[PDB]
Amino acid sequence: EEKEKKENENSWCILEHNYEDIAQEFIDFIYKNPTTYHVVSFFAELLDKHNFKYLSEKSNWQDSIGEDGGKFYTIRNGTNLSAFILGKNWRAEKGVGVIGSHVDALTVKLKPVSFKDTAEGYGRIAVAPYGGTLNELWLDRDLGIGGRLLYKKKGTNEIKSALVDSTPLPVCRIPSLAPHFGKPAEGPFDKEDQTIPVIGFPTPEPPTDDEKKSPLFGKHCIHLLRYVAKLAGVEVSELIQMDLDLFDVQKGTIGGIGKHFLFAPRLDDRLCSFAAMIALICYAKDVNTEESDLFSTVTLYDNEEIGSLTRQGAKGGLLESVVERSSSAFTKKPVDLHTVWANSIILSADVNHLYNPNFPEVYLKNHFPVPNVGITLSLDPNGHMATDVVGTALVEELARRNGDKVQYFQIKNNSRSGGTIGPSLASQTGARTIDLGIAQLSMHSIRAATGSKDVGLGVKFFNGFFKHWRSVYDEFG
Amino acid sequence: KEKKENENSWCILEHNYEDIAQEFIDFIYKNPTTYHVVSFFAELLDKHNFKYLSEKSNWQDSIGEDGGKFYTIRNGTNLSAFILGKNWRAEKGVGVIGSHVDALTVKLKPVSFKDTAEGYGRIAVAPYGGTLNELWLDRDLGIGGRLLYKKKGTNEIKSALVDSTPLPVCRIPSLAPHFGKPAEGPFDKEDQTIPVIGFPTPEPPTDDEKKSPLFGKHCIHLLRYVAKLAGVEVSELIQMDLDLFDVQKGTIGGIGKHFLFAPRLDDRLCSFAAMIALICYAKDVNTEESDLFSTVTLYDNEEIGSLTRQGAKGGLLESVVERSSSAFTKKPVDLHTVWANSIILSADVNHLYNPNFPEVYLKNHFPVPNVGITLSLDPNGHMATDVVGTALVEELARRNGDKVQYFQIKNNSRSGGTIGPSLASQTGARTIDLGIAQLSMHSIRAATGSKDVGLGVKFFNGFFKHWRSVYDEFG
Amino acid sequence: KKENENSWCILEHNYEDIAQEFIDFIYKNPTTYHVVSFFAELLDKHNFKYLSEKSNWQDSIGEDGGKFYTIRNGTNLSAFILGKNWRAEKGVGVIGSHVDALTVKLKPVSFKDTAEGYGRIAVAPYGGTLNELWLDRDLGIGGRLLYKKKGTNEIKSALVDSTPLPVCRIPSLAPHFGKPAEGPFDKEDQTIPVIGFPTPDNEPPTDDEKKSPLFGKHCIHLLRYVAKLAGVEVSELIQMDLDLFDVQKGTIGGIGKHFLFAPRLDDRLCSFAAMIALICYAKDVNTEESDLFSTVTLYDNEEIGSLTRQGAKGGLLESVVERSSSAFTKKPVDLHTVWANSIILSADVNHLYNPNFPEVYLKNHFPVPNVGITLSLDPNGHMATDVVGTALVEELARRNGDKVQYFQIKNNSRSGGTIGPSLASQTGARTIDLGIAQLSMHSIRAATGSKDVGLGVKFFNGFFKHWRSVYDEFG
Numbered sequence A: 001e002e003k004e005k006k007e008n009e010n011s012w013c014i015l016e017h018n019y020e021d022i023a024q025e026f027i028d029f030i031y032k033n034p035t036t037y038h039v040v041s042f043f044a045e046l047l048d049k050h051n052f053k054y055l056s057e058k059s060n061w062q063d064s065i066g067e068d069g070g071k072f073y074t075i076r077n078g079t080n081l082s083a084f085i086l087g088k089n090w091r092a093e094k095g096v097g098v099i100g101s102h103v104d105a106l107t108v109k110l111k112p113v114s115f116k117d118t119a120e121g122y123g124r125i126a127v128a129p130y131g132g133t134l135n136e137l138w139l140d141r142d143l144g145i146g147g148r149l150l151y152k153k154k155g156t157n158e159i160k161s162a163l164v165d166s167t168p169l170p171v172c173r174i175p176s177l178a179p180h181f182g183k184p185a186e187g188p189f190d191k192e193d194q195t196i197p198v199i200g201f202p203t204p205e206p207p208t209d210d211e212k213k214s215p216l217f218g219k220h221c222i223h224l225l226r227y228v229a230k231l232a233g234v235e236v237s238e239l240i241q242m243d244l245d246l247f248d249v250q251k252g253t254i255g256g257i258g259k260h261f262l263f264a265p266r267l268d269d270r271l272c273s274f275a276a277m278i279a280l281i282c283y284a285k286d287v288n289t290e291e292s293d294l295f296s297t298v299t300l301y302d303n304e305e306i307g308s309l310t311r312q313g314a315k316g317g318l319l320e321s322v323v324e325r326s327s328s329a330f331t332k333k334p335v336d337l338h339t340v341w342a343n344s345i346i347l348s349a350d351v352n353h354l355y356n357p358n359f360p361e362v363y364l365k366n367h368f369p370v371p372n373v374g375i376t377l378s379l380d381p382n383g384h385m386a387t388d389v390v391g392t393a394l395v396e397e398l399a400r401r402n403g404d405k406v407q408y409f410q411i412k413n414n415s416r417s418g419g420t421i422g423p424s425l426a427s428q429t430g431a432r433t434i435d436l437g438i439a440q441l442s443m444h445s446i447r448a449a450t451g452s453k454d455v456g457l458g459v460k461f462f463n464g465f466f467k468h469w470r471s472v473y474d475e476f477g
Numbered sequence B: 001k002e003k004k005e006n007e008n009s010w011c012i013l014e015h016n017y018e019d020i021a022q023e024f025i026d027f028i029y030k031n032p033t034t035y036h037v038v039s040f041f042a043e044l045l046d047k048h049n050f051k052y053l054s055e056k057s058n059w060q061d062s063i064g065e066d067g068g069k070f071y072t073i074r075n076g077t078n079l080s081a082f083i084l085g086k087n088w089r090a091e092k093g094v095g096v097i098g099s100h101v102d103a104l105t106v107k108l109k110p111v112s113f114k115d116t117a118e119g120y121g122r123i124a125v126a127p128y129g130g131t132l133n134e135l136w137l138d139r140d141l142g143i144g145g146r147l148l149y150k151k152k153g154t155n156e157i158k159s160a161l162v163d164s165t166p167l168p169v170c171r172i173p174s175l176a177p178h179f180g181k182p183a184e185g186p187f188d189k190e191d192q193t194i195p196v197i198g199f200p201t202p203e204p205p206t207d208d209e210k211k212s213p214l215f216g217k218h219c220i221h222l223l224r225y226v227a228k229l230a231g232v233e234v235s236e237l238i239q240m241d242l243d244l245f246d247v248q249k250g251t252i253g254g255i256g257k258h259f260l261f262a263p264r265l266d267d268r269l270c271s272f273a274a275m276i277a278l279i280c281y282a283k284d285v286n287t288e289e290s291d292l293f294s295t296v297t298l299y300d301n302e303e304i305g306s307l308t309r310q311g312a313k314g315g316l317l318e319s320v321v322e323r324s325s326s327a328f329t330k331k332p333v334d335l336h337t338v339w340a341n342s343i344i345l346s347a348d349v350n351h352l353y354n355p356n357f358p359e360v361y362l363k364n365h366f367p368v369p370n371v372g373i374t375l376s377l378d379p380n381g382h383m384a385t386d387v388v389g390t391a392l393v394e395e396l397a398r399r400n401g402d403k404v405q406y407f408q409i410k411n412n413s414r415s416g417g418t419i420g421p422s423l424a425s426q427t428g429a430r431t432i433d434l435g436i437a438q439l440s441m442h443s444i445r446a447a448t449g450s451k452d453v454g455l456g457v458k459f460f461n462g463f464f465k466h467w468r469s470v471y472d473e474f475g
Numbered sequence C: 001k002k003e004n005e006n007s008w009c010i011l012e013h014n015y016e017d018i019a020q021e022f023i024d025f026i027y028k029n030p031t032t033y034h035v036v037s038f039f040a041e042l043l044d045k046h047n048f049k050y051l052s053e054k055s056n057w058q059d060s061i062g063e064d065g066g067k068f069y070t071i072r073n074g075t076n077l078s079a080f081i082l083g084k085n086w087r088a089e090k091g092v093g094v095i096g097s098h099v100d101a102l103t104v105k106l107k108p109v110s111f112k113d114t115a116e117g118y119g120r121i122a123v124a125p126y127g128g129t130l131n132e133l134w135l136d137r138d139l140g141i142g143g144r145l146l147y148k149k150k151g152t153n154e155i156k157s158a159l160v161d162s163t164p165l166p167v168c169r170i171p172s173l174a175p176h177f178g179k180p181a182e183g184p185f186d187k188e189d190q191t192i193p194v195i196g197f198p199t200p201d202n203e204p205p206t207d208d209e210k211k212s213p214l215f216g217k218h219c220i221h222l223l224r225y226v227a228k229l230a231g232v233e234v235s236e237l238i239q240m241d242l243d244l245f246d247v248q249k250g251t252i253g254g255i256g257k258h259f260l261f262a263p264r265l266d267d268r269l270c271s272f273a274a275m276i277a278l279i280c281y282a283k284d285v286n287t288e289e290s291d292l293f294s295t296v297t298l299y300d301n302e303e304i305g306s307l308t309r310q311g312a313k314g315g316l317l318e319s320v321v322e323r324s325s326s327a328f329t330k331k332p333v334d335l336h337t338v339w340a341n342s343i344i345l346s347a348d349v350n351h352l353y354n355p356n357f358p359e360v361y362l363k364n365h366f367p368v369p370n371v372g373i374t375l376s377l378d379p380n381g382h383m384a385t386d387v388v389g390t391a392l393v394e395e396l397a398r399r400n401g402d403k404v405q406y407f408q409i410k411n412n413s414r415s416g417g418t419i420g421p422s423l424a425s426q427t428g429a430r431t432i433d434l435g436i437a438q439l440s441m442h443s444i445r446a447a448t449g450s451k452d453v454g455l456g457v458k459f460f461n462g463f464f465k466h467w468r469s470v471y472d473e474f475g
């Protein structure tokens, strides 16, 4: 009972040097929450279990947050979440300790009309890529279906939503052509005409009159509508709309001959999102908000893989909104947000690239990370990352204090860089922003890899950030 | 009787789609530049009892507890009209239609002067967006836009709009195919697609005309002409912002009159439909009794990416809502709560199925003429439309008796972007990309359905009436 | 006193002194850090009070207004003068420029193994550097060191500069070797700075030196060198952000001394000219009497797209005006009214006519040396300049006795973009892109007219004196 509670804290927050348990919780998390909707829902439920109070965006917060502050979260669009801890003794000059990550991952979306005519008896579905999917890595993979259904119960005018998930059933697969056929079997393949998921081969019930009353009748195969309705526990007639993903249902696993690796889908950026959220929860356990003088948050964004210019992406400003609304409700007096942000540190936590020993020519000597060491700073002099000399120094100081190791990633001068939310958050807030993350192999694959210790090592680092960033940043004044 | 007949034609109350189609054609023809379009809507708003508010003055003394019907203009090319009900509160949100009034055109260069070329007069021009291609060759081009002038013996700089219509002052002449390879396009936009304005025979500049700041920057024939159109002296002209545009008047067409052919549909088609819908809706709205905040905001510079003060990224919508709500309550307004409860229709024209290019249209995701409004859907952020917005629009249409169509690109194709994503992130409000579909977007002369203007007006009117009620189903 | 004012502020037609001060400024302040520090020291000497971003400005700015400046990141500076009689309807008179220039940055780990005895350092390009123009140039090293004195927990900053010593040179391969000596060259493997060729008798690292966080990240000779320049121990070094730059001092040139040759003109030329205009202007402003709000805001990261906290998109201008106006009045300020009445000059260098490349310059739309400020015009959103802005600057010039030139690209050419569109969009204010024209933009060593620095200062000084009065004629 009491020993199990101590052992639980030790596993989740790596207090007894137990990295294996947190690695498995991450794997289970990825497997049980295939879509962005599931991930945000998982964290929402996690936050409820650790006494964070949900606040709706749709209502003013002046009545919900008082002088004692506390632990809160809000959700936008079901895909964009911000959790935060506000201290009774917080002032504008203390700033905010932020970790910003994204919860969207490369996937395949069902088209608004997924219906395709049968092709020599084969059932197929019309889909679209979200980011750079539907390539050769997506061929011959077991694909489940899941996401958000919108429904309206009979004899009501309420539109409600349900999350669905076929796991472990792979409902479809994108079949490669056998190499025996020659040149037609050689990639790359047309994302509209060639990489189409095969969902069935049915044999010889037709649609009922009630099923035909569904808004989605004609838009999707009657078998599909029946299936998702059964998963949701509603009638076909009640289905209003849907937003469904196809995703790899292969469960993650520890691997390598010495178990040094973790293989799993959708690491970018659910890896950092998970580690940052668990760190927040671990940190929150020992925070009395009545005595604290800090403002801490993890904010999770959608649509980072498509450039962040949506209301649920980093450019939509959920962070800025949360800090403005909370501080207004907290003090009930004029808060200078420019002073707030000038004293803040934002960690833009996004996965970066582990050294791949089979492609040494793309990695910059002395500026790549390796597995199971620690967090990696993303450095770039051309604005792809927001990291600057003070932020580098802050993180290195933090790590030396907390016993963490820090690695570097920067591109070769003849190479090219990805871009993160970091520059966007820095510009929108005016606050010093540091791009960093847990490094991984095979980013944007359907199944990626990181170190087996790296989930725990990330949790450890981010926990130390929340504990010590304010004290460390004060050295620079 | 006359007022009942006008309401039927303009607001499609008696099922009359012909008249509103003709008014749209007349509107496009009579207002060739963005300046003219904004001026048209300003005059229209004045006639329906909307009060102009200047951006340069604080609105607290102009808007009170009763709210009302208002509009404002930035740069002469960015206009926001709004209806603020006396019983509005932050949790009601705002119902917004955002469209753009800029269209592909050709601009006179700051110095339009060119030396005569074997006797031919020509003017130096620049493309605004993807113009000066083969579709702009051999078209009758009028000249028009904004002149800035200063009356002689005064210091004030004033504005006049000018328009040569029906006179086409110039034409970009194709080379006869007889000459062979030189006559094959594409053509150089600087050296080959140059408007020919005249061929003058053997008065030189007077001493007064030389006092013009524009003397030497434009041909004296041109300066005299635009001076005459504005009713000012050449000496008084300080600057100008002039377009060249197709003066071919729009028309109903097709063997069964199913089509409307007209220039500059992108996006004056949705802008007109949304604005007429707002005026129709406003006729039956008592602002003393209303609990809603409704707006149509019209932007400039969308075709060049919206990053100007008069484009979507310049934030006129957000400013209007902030200034209105501060003046209205005279107390702190939670603008985050306002936008969280809002719906933005990003109304921009999308693509009708072209039966001659079936390979670029996505099966089950193309619109056809004369059916209804088309949702623009995109999973990679080119459009702001999401699952809830789709369901909302479909719910709204089922209630109002409208039809809804889909547009989405093929996976192996390419998509343009709209202001929708910009508005969504700037406000944090759910934004829905949709519009009236058309053929031949970005041509000098495009086409849509002859009923689509009226169908568009009907849908947007339905939006203003029922969006709040329908969106409450999702809460 | 009068001789100093006449030299700096060009009051007795002395253009050579200010040109030489500019050359000295460029030579003594090679990095963005030095440039901001130079302007900070200049502002201090002219009685502008420094305000930290990290504290509320309520206790530093009162109803009297005054002369102030603030700094973000050591590279983003905003200086401003706020009049006691200022109100929202007077707006703000803004010059916005950038102080970052194309350079070469040391990598976070600059260490390289010796290569047949040669010492080299690992570096990266900031903008389009490490090309053939960067070969065979004498390169100095300088920038910001972070250190922590022994027995303290205080991270402090020091600026270092090797000038006149060129520590580095990127050596071209001799043409004798043939094809390998033909560019372009790989920026990672071929354009690597050579820093030395050490001999055995450069001592081994001491135990204290090994305690540095930077031990292993840079070779010990480099660490010892930068420690000696800052006056600290190697062990105390925490981090560094260092540039490589041309140490060739600028000069007046041409057979008639019509030119000025110097490195890093983009955009320290306009920044210097704008800042000196502000100080010259500020000498005769009594803030107790003034009703104006004036600012020069200097940005970092313009050359890489401005999307950082210290770039234009980070909003230091907007922040300055909001914080100032809040502390100034303590009765709420309508910022939308403020910006609606404002003028922003986006002052960034544009392109002088290069007579060797006539084919890329647009006839009647290029500037020449020693005439005056050049308006940057573009109808596709690369610049923010509009017809009213053009007329304002021309009016202003006519009143102050300045000359104005034009720059616009040919229809078949390509344009760069400035911060102008960003600033116009973020504020909603009318923004005018203009600048002092130069040859050879983005070279390691560029050129402008020898009179153009003074002509720039004179024009910008005229702007601060007269912009409010002139813009009132357009109302």
Ligand SMILES: C[As](C)(=O)[O-]
Pocket: A183, A184, A185, A186, A187, A188, A189, A190
């Ligand atoms: C050669 As193919 C278009 O079938 O990948």
Ligand SMILES: C[As](C)(=O)[O-]
Pocket: A268, A269, A304, A305, A350, A418, A419, A420
């Ligand atoms: C766009 As990314 C840095 O999540 O691969």
Ligand SMILES: C[As](C)(=O)[O-]
Pocket: B181, B182, B183, B184, B185, B186, B187, B188
């Ligand atoms: C070959 As050509 C420039 O006359 O279209």
Ligand SMILES: C[As](C)(=O)[O-]
Pocket: B266, B267, B302, B303, B348, B416, B417, B418
């Ligand atoms: C830039 As567009 C969607 O108006 O063609």
Ligand SMILES: C[As](C)(=O)[O-]
Pocket: C179, C180, C181, C182, C183, C184, C185, C186
């Ligand atoms: C031809 As080479 C890559 O040595 O510049």
Ligand SMILES: C[As](C)(=O)[O-]
Pocket: C266, C267, C302, C303, C304, C348, C416, C417, C418
């Ligand atoms: C990006 As630029 C207009 O300073 O060359």
Ligand SMILES: [Zn+2]
Pocket: A268, A305, A443, A444
């Ligand atoms: Zn990614």
Ligand SMILES: [Zn+2]
Pocket: A268, A269, A350, A351
């Ligand atoms: Zn990522």
Ligand SMILES: [Zn+2]
Pocket: B266, B303, B441, B442
């Ligand atoms: Zn368009």
Ligand SMILES: [Zn+2]
Pocket: B266, B267, B348, B349
């Ligand atoms: Zn459009």
Ligand SMILES: [Zn+2]
Pocket: C266, C303, C441, C442
């Ligand atoms: Zn530049």
Ligand SMILES: [Zn+2]
Pocket: C266, C267, C302, C348, C349
């Ligand atoms: Zn520049």
